[PDB]
Amino acid sequence: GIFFPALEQNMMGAVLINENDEVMFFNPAAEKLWGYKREEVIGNNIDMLIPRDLRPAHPEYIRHNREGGKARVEGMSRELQLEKKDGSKIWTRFALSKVSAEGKVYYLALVRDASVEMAQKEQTRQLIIAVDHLDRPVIVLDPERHIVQCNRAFTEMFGYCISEASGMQPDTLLNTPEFPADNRIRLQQLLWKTARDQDEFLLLTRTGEKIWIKASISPVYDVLAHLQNLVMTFSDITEERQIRQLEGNILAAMCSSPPFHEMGEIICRNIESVLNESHVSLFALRNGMPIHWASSSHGAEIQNAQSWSATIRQRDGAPAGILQIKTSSGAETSAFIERVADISQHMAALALEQEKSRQHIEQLIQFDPMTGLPNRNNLHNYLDDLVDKAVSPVVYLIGVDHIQDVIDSLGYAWADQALLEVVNRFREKLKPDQYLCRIEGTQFVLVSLENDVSNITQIADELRNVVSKPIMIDDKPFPLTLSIGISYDLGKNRDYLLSTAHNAMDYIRKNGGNGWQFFSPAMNEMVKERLVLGAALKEAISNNQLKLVYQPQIFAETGELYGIEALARWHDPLHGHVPPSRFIPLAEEIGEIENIGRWVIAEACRQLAEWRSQNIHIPALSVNLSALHFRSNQLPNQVSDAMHAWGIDGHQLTVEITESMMMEHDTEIFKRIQILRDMGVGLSVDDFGTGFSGLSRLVSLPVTEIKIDKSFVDRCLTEKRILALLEAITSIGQSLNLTVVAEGVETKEQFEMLRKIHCRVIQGYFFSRPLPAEEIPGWMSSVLPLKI
């Protein structure tokens, strides 16, 4: 056989043993491997070749193999040890084989050195223990994006294992939530990115827990620039997303520049948001002495409380503030709390330094950013000037209410806009003599010089009605209210006035706000008296318990009744007799003047119908109307109704207007007068108007009568210069056919002294006091004519 020397010189050392477990064949390669020679090996039991430990065990191993047979079993190639000539031990690769010839059974084992193979195995083990040491999960993927390798950190974080995850897609392996933010497409795009990339996803463990993980994919190529593998690393980011949220919230709040206390509160609550069940405190340095900035706690005692005290450093490096974090027993890692404190101190240094600079400047600042109004120091100086000038002012303290709603709904950048809108509305209505300033927060101070209750209440009502309509910001309505406190006293300092106004405003706010009040209950009760009087007047108007008293007018020469003027009168069961000089202006303030006008016109016309039933001529009847009455485009409707419902057509009715009405210039009012004048009813002007040119226009807008006021008539006795007034007034009387009326005559000498100027008619107490309608007919039939 030509194969004898071939297997003799083959690379693998070949050892052949016969039935007797003795070596019969042996070759030079095995000589080199073991150390002994052919003459030293041939004819000896395999026991000498076996290492010493297995010496007894090897024979029964061979015997068991012989007994079993197993249809000529040859074993499997593996790795084993040798004992050399000097006793050294080496790793070798064995392949055994069983031979059966001539009924007997022989064996041969082929051996190669395995130093490289065992070095590889040691490298494998050391590399595995290097992988499974740090808790940063890494996995490897083939070109087809199938996971092929894992580690203990990954299997512990996600529950899976290499056996249940080998050779399958990573998206299919990792179950994602049901479209929370469309993260499925993001995960596929990160898997399919061809360059180094990273992303953040939301995943659930094998059990299922809401965990966010940051994944990073990197490609690794081969020598010839082909894709070889993709490695994906993961890291849990749950502890860092919350810190990102904290820094975002603090940054957003600080960009709006909130006040110091509320900024501290925001920081504290945001720290608590990331530290579950903790307590946080903030202190500032005031000349080295710590003071309390803000805090937030539930008050519950924290047993075994870990306490940390972080120090805030300014730009130069000096300490400025102290932040105390107290946490439960082992709630969170110390590095977490250290990081939170560091980021918080970095973000709070700016707040502390801006607060310090703000205090330093505001010690002496006499103005105010954010609505540009004056401030407390300016108000103090103004009030001190007023006090030393000895002029007692009226102080209104105004608190704007419901601003916290917009603060919590939109933010400080919009609360400021609401304040600006309110201040602009106030500026749109402030009078020249009023002083407006801002003291603190949502509080403002108005200084006025009106020492009169009727004007003070009007100013307060106007101020409260300023905010009647909602404020539209960012296309969102926001109804705000006002609480006003009013203080006015004589000889009082700034402190007394400010304290009283603050007390009034605080009482209104505590009771519910949306209103105004005085101090000084004695002055407060007058408002209740006025409201009850006005309610009684309105009730009387509605119930028609009002009256008309008629005073005649007489001629100078013939002593004949020129006409009468109807005057409104009122008597209440509770308030007695209310003079018309009192309750007519009261109706102007309320708004019942129109109701008065309709009643008087209807009653006066109806009374003329009653007098016409019997024999009474009554040439004319004068009825007073107010300026606010004539401002409406409804007068001819009711007046025409009066005439044609009782046959009192306008040649008998007469209407007199106030002097101030001609002072005003309204085209619509004048046209209504001209329409009314053309109907037949006359027009009369009291107080002789204002000027000849105006009365010349009153000649253009035709009238019939001119009335000389009582004050002018009374002064005619002494002031001899005003005689030409009546002479000129009467001159226009016959110049263009006007009837002049003398009012308030009281003595005979007055009647004779106005006779020479030729006053057309005379109306006064020298002839008759006003009389109730039930004896108007008696007066006509009794004294007519009179002494002339």
81 is a contact residue toward ligand HEM (CB under 6 A):
yes
| Token pair 């602009």: residue | 424
- C-alpha 777/C-alpha 328 separation (Å) is 101
Q: How far is the CB of 768 from Mg ion (least distance, A)?
A: 15
- C-alpha 88/C-alpha 398 separation (Å) is 103
Structure tokens at 694: 């105006």
Question: Scanning residues 538 to 557, which ones bind ligand C2E (CB under 6 A)?
Answer: 551
713 is a contact residue toward ligand C2E (CB under 6 A):
no
**453 interface partner picked from ligand HEM, Mg ion, its own copies, none, CB below 5 to 8 A per type:** none
600 is a contact residue toward ligand C2E (CB under 6 A):
yes
Q: Is 76 annotated as a binding residue?
A: yes
- C-alpha 581/C-alpha 660 separation (Å) is 17
Nearest CB to its own copies, comparing residues 253 and 625: 253
Structure tokens at 85: 């000539």
Q: How far is the CB of 255 from its own copies (least distance, A)?
A: 5
Nearest CB to ligand C2E, comparing residues 105 and 567: 567
Q: How far is the CB of 142 from ligand HEM (least distance, A)?
A: 25
Nearest CB to ligand HEM, comparing residues 84 and 547: 84
Q: Cα–Cα distances in Å, from 533 out to 525, 528, 538, 574, 694?
A: 12, 9, 9, 10, 38
Nearest CB to ligand HEM, comparing residues 77 and 545: 77
Residue 556's contacts (CB-CB under 8 Å, 6 or more residues apart) are 754, 755, 758, 759, 760, 761, 762, 788
Residues of this chain that interact with Mg ion (CB under 5 A) are: 624, 686, 743
Q: How far is the CB of 776 from Mg ion (least distance, A)?
A: 18
Long-range Cβ contact pairs of 600-603 (< 8 A, separation 24 or more): 600/548, 600/566, 600/568, 600/624, 601/638, 601/639, 601/642, 602/638, 602/642, 603/546, 603/548
Question: Scanning residues 87 to 146, which ones bind ligand HEM (CB under 6 A)?
Answer: 96, 107, 109
Q: How far is the CB of 83 from ligand HEM (least distance, A)?
A: 7
Q: How far is the CB of 109 from ligand HEM (least distance, A)?
A: 4
**686 interface partner picked from Mg ion, ligand HEM, its own copies, none, CB below 5 to 8 A per type:** Mg ion
- C-alpha 379/C-alpha 447 separation (Å) is 9
Site string for ligand C2E, 617-656 (x = CB under 6 A): -------xxx------------------------------
Nearest CB to ligand HEM, comparing residues 21 and 649: 21
Question: Scanning residues 737 to 776, which ones bind ligand C2E (CB under 6 A)?
Answer: 743-746, 763-765, 770
Residue of 720, 756, 715 lying closest to 556 (CA atoms): 756
Q: Is 298 annotated as a binding residue?
A: no
584 is a contact residue toward ligand C2E (CB under 6 A):
yes
592 is a contact residue toward ligand C2E (CB under 6 A):
no
Q: How far is the CB of 621 from its own copies (least distance, A)?
A: 28
DSSP 337-393: HHHHHHHHHHHHHHHHHHHHHHHHHHTT--S-SSS----HHHHHHHHHHHHHTT---
Give per-residue burial for 21-60: e unless 16+ CB within 10 Å, then b: bebebbbebbeebbebeeeebeeeebeebbeeeeeeebee
Nearest CB to ligand HEM, comparing residues 28 and 591: 28
Residue of 438, 424, 426 lying closest to 379 (CA atoms): 438
Q: How far is the CB of 477 from its own copies (least distance, A)?
A: 15
> Using CB under 6 A, which of the segments 44-52, 231-239, 698-706, 717-725 binds ligand HEM?
44-52
713 is a contact residue toward ligand HEM (CB under 6 A):
no
Q: How far is the CB of 49 from ligand HEM (least distance, A)?
A: 5
Residue of 611, 630, 629 lying closest to 619 (CA atoms): 611
**369 interface partner picked from ligand HEM, ligand C2E, its own copies, none, CB below 5 to 8 A per type:** its own copies
Q: How far is the CB of 763 from ligand C2E (least distance, A)?
A: 6
**744 interface partner picked from its own copies, Mg ion, ligand C2E, none, CB below 5 to 8 A per type:** ligand C2E
Site size for ligand C2E (CB under 6 A): 20
568 is a contact residue toward ligand C2E (CB under 6 A):
yes
Is the Cβ–Cβ distance between 765 and 751 less than 8 Å?
no
221 is a contact residue toward ligand HEM (CB under 6 A):
no
Q: Residue 204: enclosing H or E segment and its boundaries?
A: none
| 3-state secondary structure (DSSP) of residue 145 | coil
Structure tokens at 256: 């709006």
DSSP-assigned beta bridge partners for residue 221? 227
What 3 state SS string does 332-352 have? CCHHHHHHHHHHHHHHHHHHH
Q: Cα–Cα distances in Å, from 289 out to 320, 325, 565?
A: 10, 20, 83
Q: Between vectors from CA 637 to CA 537 and to CA 644, what angle results, nearest 5°?
A: 105
Nearest CB to ligand C2E, comparing residues 141 and 625: 625
- C-alpha 217/C-alpha 229 separation (Å) is 10
367 is a contact residue toward ligand C2E (CB under 6 A):
no
Binding residues, by number, are: 58, 76
| Residues engaged in binding ligand C2E (CB under 6 A) | 551, 567-568, 579-581, 584, 596, 600, 624-626, 743-746, 763-765, 770
| Residues engaged in binding ligand HEM (CB under 6 A) | 15, 17, 46, 49-51, 54, 61-62, 64-65, 75-76, 80-82, 96, 107, 109
Binding residues for heme, by number, are: 58, 76
